[PDB]
Amino acid sequence: LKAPVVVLGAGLASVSFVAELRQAGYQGLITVVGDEAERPYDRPPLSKDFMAHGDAEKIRLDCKRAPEVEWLLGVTAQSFDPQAHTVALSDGRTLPYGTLVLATGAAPRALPTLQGATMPVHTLRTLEDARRIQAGLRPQSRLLIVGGGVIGLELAATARTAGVHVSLVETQPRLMSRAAPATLADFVARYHAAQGVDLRFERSVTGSVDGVVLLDDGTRIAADMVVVGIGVLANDALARAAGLACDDGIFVDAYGRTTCPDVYALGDVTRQRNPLSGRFERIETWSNAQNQGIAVARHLVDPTAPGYAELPWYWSDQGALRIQVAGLASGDEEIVRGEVSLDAPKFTLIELQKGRIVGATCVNNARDFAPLRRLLAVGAKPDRAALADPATDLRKLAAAV
Amino acid sequence: LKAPVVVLGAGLASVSFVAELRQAGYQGLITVVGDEAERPYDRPPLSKDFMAHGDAEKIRLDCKRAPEVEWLLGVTAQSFDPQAHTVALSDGRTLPYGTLVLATGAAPRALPTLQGATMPVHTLRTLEDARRIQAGLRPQSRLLIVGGGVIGLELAATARTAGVHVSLVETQPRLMSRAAPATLADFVARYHAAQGVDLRFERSVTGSVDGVVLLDDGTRIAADMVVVGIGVLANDALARAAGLACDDGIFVDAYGRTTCPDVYALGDVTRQRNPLSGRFERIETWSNAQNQGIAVARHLVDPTAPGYAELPWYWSDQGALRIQVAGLASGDEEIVRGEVSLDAPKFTLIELQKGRIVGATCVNNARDFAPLRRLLAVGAKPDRAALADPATDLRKLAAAV
Ligand SMILES: Cc1cc2nc3c(=O)[nH]c(=O)nc-3n(C[C@H](O)[C@H](O)[C@H](O)COP(=O)(O)OP(=O)(O)OC[C@H]3O[C@@H](n4cnc5c(N)ncnc54)[C@H](O)[C@@H]3O)c2cc1C
Numbered sequence: 154l155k156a157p158v159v160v161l162g163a164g165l166a167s168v169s170f171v172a173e174l175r176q177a178g179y180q181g182l183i184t185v186v187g188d189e190a191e192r193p194y195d196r197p198p199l200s201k202d203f204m205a206h207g208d209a210e211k212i213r214l215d216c217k218r219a220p221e222v223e224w225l226l227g228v229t230a231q232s233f234d235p236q237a238h239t240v241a242l243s244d245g246r247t248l249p250y251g252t253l254v255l256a257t258g259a260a261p262r263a264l265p266t267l268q269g270a271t272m273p274v275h276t277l278r279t280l281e282d283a284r285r286i287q288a289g290l291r292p293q294s295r296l297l298i299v300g301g302g303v304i305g306l307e308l309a310a311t312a313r314t315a316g317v318h319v320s321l322v323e324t325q326p327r328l329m330s331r332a333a334p335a336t337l338a339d340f341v342a343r344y345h346a347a348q349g350v351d352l353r354f355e356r357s358v359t360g361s362v363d364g365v366v367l368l369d370d371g372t373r374i375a376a377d378m379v380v381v382g383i384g385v386l387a388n389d390a391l392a393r394a395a396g397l398a399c400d401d402g403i404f405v406d407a408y409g410r411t412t413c414p415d416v417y418a419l420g421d422v423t424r425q426r427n428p429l430s431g432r433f434e435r436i437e438t439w440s441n442a443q444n445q446g447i448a449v450a451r452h453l454v455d456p457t458a459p460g461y462a463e464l465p466w467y468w469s470d471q472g473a474l475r476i477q478v479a480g481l482a483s484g485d486e487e488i489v490r491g492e493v494s495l496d497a498p499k500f501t502l503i504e505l506q507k508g509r510i511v512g513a514t515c516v517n518n519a520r521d522f523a524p525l526r527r528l529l530a531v532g533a534k535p536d537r538a539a540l541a542d543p544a545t546d547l548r549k550l551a552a553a554v
Numbered sequence: 555l556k557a558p559v560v561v562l563g564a565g566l567a568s569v570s571f572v573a574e575l576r577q578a579g580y581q582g583l584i585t586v587v588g589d590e591a592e593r594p595y596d597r598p599p600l601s602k603d604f605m606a607h608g609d610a611e612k613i614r615l616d617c618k619r620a621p622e623v624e625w626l627l628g629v630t631a632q633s634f635d636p637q638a639h640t641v642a643l644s645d646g647r648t649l650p651y652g653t654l655v656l657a658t659g660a661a662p663r664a665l666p667t668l669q670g671a672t673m674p675v676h677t678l679r680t681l682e683d684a685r686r687i688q689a690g691l692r693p694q695s696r697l698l699i700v701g702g703g704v705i706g707l708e709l710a711a712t713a714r715t716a717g718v719h720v721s722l723v724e725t726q727p728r729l730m731s732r733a734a735p736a737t738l739a740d741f742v743a744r745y746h747a748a749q750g751v752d753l754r755f756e757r758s759v760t761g762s763v764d765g766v767v768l769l770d771d772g773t774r775i776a777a778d779m780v781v782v783g784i785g786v787l788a789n790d791a792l793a794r795a796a797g798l799a800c801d802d803g804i805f806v807d808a809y810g811r812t813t814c815p816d817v818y819a820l821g822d823v824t825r826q827r828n829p830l831s832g833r834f835e836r837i838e839t840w841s842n843a844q845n846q847g848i849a850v851a852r853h854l855v856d857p858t859a860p861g862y863a864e865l866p867w868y869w870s871d872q873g874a875l876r877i878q879v880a881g882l883a884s885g886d887e888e889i890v891r892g893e894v895s896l897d898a899p900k901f902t903l904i905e906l907q908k909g910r911i912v913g914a915t916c917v918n919n920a921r922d923f924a925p926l927r928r929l930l931a932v933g934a935k936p937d938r939a940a941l942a943d944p945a946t947d948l949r950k951l952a953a954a955v
């Protein structure tokens with residue numbers, strides 16, 4: 154840790170990091186460069202209550218645990234020179250750094266086949282995006298969503314609640330192929346279908362003409378608005394240009410170090426080790442942005458601190474479904490706790506590998522999720538019959554281990 | 555570049571690197587730690603003329619362009635401490651370093667289903683391995699090779715020349731799936747089949763009993779010896795333990811930097827950017843080991859030098875086939891120069907993407923390969939009709955661009 158500290162990006166990873174630097178006792182300069190002209194804010198509300206209530210003053214991040222930080226909002230870092238230890242800003246200024254931290258997140262992938270579209274086609278990442286989409290959620294209008302990932306499905310649920318007709322096109326045979334157990338994905342499809350979402354599996358968009366979207370089965374979907382949610386791409390351009398190791402994401406170790414001395418990276422922009430799979434992955438979650446930012450800050454201030462070690466997890470709020478998912482989507486065994494039913498949905502899935510818990514899912518069962526994450530963290534090997542048995546208390550099991 | 559320099563591994567990447575350090579003018583200490591008790595040697599001969607002639611004194615690497623290097627042969631680096639800047643050796647000594655270079659290569663993957671085998675099962679990476687295999691190439695004996703990659707096929711050709719009966723089991727529908735155009739792989743299969751190799755595609759080994767290997771189609775192959783060639787795994791254990799970013803290979807940028815300050819990596823142990831695909835890959839070639847070692851050395855001595863920028867290529871010698879392959883195995887177009895025939899095989903393949911050359915293959919046509927590599931390097935977009943036309947001189951084309 155060399156002063157001054159400069160962070161590029163003012164999202165959750167950046168805020169979490171700078172707050173932890175302060176809390177851990179670093180008293181040198183901190184400057185944060187954020188391209189959005191917005192008081193730092195959290196993204197999960199954008200496809201949830203914000204999309205429904207529209208009050209941005211409910212979604213701001215708490216920067217009060219980060220005193221004495223200059224936030225340069227509405228400014229873009231254009232490049233950095235890792236020899237000179239400087240960053241070039243879009244407003245013509247240059248910042249010196251001792252330690253540079255790249256927390257620039259990721260951007261929605263565009264759909265090449267809609268590039269020349271003459272109808273509204275949006276993606277959903279920013280507050281500006283959310284406002285633009287919400288303005289078009291007219292009751293009885295038709296929305297097409299491209300992509301059956303969590304954000305697309307959260308938008309689908311939000312739009313149906315708003316009285317919007319929703320169609321959704323997914324290239325895979327299932328929803329949430331990226332990070333969800335098949336049992337969960339099958340149920341989620343049944344839920345959205347029951348709520349009036351017109352789901353099209355194993356279809357892709359081939360183009361569009363005069364307000365109608367074309368599919369690869371040679372058919373058509375008329376829509377008033379298209380929202381594309383086919384994944385994201387790391388915002389790693391400054392890193393690539395500066396000669397850091399990148400591949401749709403900046404490679405970092407558990408200390409957040411890039412291949413360039415004195416340059417670190419955090420959050421959605423990073424490709425990092427998933428301790429459960431033992432492979433490098435881009436981990437695109439709120440918990441990662443916060444926890445990785447905190448861990449990297451802590452170890453910079455106190456080199457005796459361990460590197461980042463948290464196991465992955467996320468949640469999704471889709472209408473009546475409060476979904477929580479931790480760890481790996483599959484192993485060699487799944488245990489189902491509760492009935493999987495559209496009538497008052499409430500269940501837990503547990504994924505095992507050779508008897509060891511490697512993942513878990515809770516649907517409308519938050520009480521079970523914390524204990525399961527603890528069992529997951531220690532690689533617990535509980536009695537499978539006990540894990541299945543409804544009479545088993547999971548909190549006690551986690552306390553006993 | 556801080557003295558002293560310590561390199562872990564004494565293969566081609568290490569020798570190439572240390573020779574370049576000297577040639578570029580670095581005069582400080584260089585110490586190389588090599589676990590094999592062997593004068594540094596090249597591996598390609600092991601499945602080629604060595605396997606046939608057995609003279610190791612024809613396969614040694616030239617270390618004369620690396621004066622004043624202490625080579626600690628037959629010694630294993632057990633760990634390094636990147637804070638203390640030391641390396642712990644198996645002989646009880648410790649080496650200090652200013653700059654540490656990890657050039658530890660890769661090891662053959664074992665076949666889990668043969669782990670408890672009670673018949674000879676070998677892999678082919680080292681001189682010791684080659685001697686052990688050669689000792690068992692008894693004429694009229696039966697060899698089973700597991701894996702239809704280049705080393706397995708070179709061994710197949712060598713064994714057939716020696717009068718050994720050869721069967722080969724490949725999980726994929728084709729040979730050389732890793733880095734060869736399908737047109738080449740189809741031809742190579744026809745060649746080996748015509749030479750008496752018993753090829754089994756879309757088969758896997760499930761186990762073995764009393765000198766017989768079992769397959770997943772429920773059948774059997776009797777053999778006197780099994781050689782497993784199912785790929786390699788990076789020797790990145792010291793890097794993983796020391797906290798560097800690794801995933802079956804140490805991530806490096808174009809300067810050879812790892813995520814740990816003052817630690818570099820080179821050759822088979824690295825995962826690095828392929829400029830043609832724009833993705834990170836482990837590049838398992840002789841040309842990479844040499845060229846990456848040279849580039850990393852050059853830039854350490856002269857920071858104004860560019861990073862590593864060479865495009866990938868390899869060769870394989872399989873009986874009557876002298877195969878050369880550069881760049882990508884496929885694009886959106888292949889152009890075939892010459893007839894593809896078992897009668898005096900001689901042809902060239904050119905892979906294009908939107909008219910730009912992205913790969914090339916020469917079979918028994920070395921004269922064409924150099925010009926094609928030059929056209930590939932500049933991303934030439936030659937006239938496709940000219941590229942096909944047998945009347946076209948490729949050397950002139952490369953000279954004109
Ligand atoms: C609609 C939506 C819903 C989500 N829901 C959930 C959820 O329910 N659960 C969950 O686990 N995760 C959810 N996520 C994911 C979560 O919000 C992200 O993982 C988190 O935002 C990543 O934070 P970050 O700081 O790494 O990146 P970001 O939040 O993207 O912040 C990076 C910032 O850097 C800025 N930037 C980029 N380049 C530059 C530059 N050159 N100069 C200056 N600034 C730059 C970007 O514009 C951005 O403002 C959701 C995300 C979205 C978009």
Ligand SMILES: Cc1cc2nc3c(=O)[nH]c(=O)nc-3n(C[C@H](O)[C@H](O)[C@H](O)COP(=O)(O)OP(=O)(O)OC[C@H]3O[C@@H](n4cnc5c(N)ncnc54)[C@H](O)[C@@H]3O)c2cc1C
Pocket residue numbers: 562563564565566567568587588589590596597598599600601629630631632657658659660678679680705789792820821822823838839840841843867868869870871
């Ligand atoms: C049989 C065979 C045939 C091949 N044919 C061709 C060919 O025709 N064309 C082509 O392009 N490529 C070919 N190759 C590939 C090429 O030889 C490799 O790409 C090259 O050997 C990689 O060199 P390297 O220095 O990175 O690694 P290596 O050659 O593996 O050297 C690394 C050295 O480090 C040692 N080491 C590992 N860990 C430690 C430690 N902790 N302490 C000390 N030493 C350690 C290893 O034992 C090894 O001696 C062939 C390889 C083999 C095995």
Ligand SMILES: Nc1ncnc2c1ncn2[C@@H]1O[C@H](COP(=O)(O)OP(=O)(O)O)[C@@H](O)[C@H]1O
Pocket residue numbers: 264299300301302303304305322323324325327328329330331356357358381382383384385
């Ligand atoms: N071209 C495409 N058309 C339709 N669906 C796609 C396409 N590419 C990817 N998908 C699907 O879109 C979904 C994206 O999900 P996810 O990765 O969670 O991203 P997002 O954050 O945008 O929801 C996945 O289920 C994936 O299979």
Ligand SMILES: Nc1ncnc2c1ncn2[C@@H]1O[C@H](COP(=O)(O)OP(=O)(O)O)[C@@H](O)[C@H]1O
Pocket residue numbers: 665700701702703704705706723724725726728729730731732757758759782783784785786
């Ligand atoms: N379990 C397996 N059984 C049989 N063949 C395999 C298995 N795993 C991989 N292979 C095949 O083995 C070949 C290995 O080729 P390559 O990657 O060049 O490695 P090598 O250097 O050992 O030849 C590939 O064609 C691959 O499809």
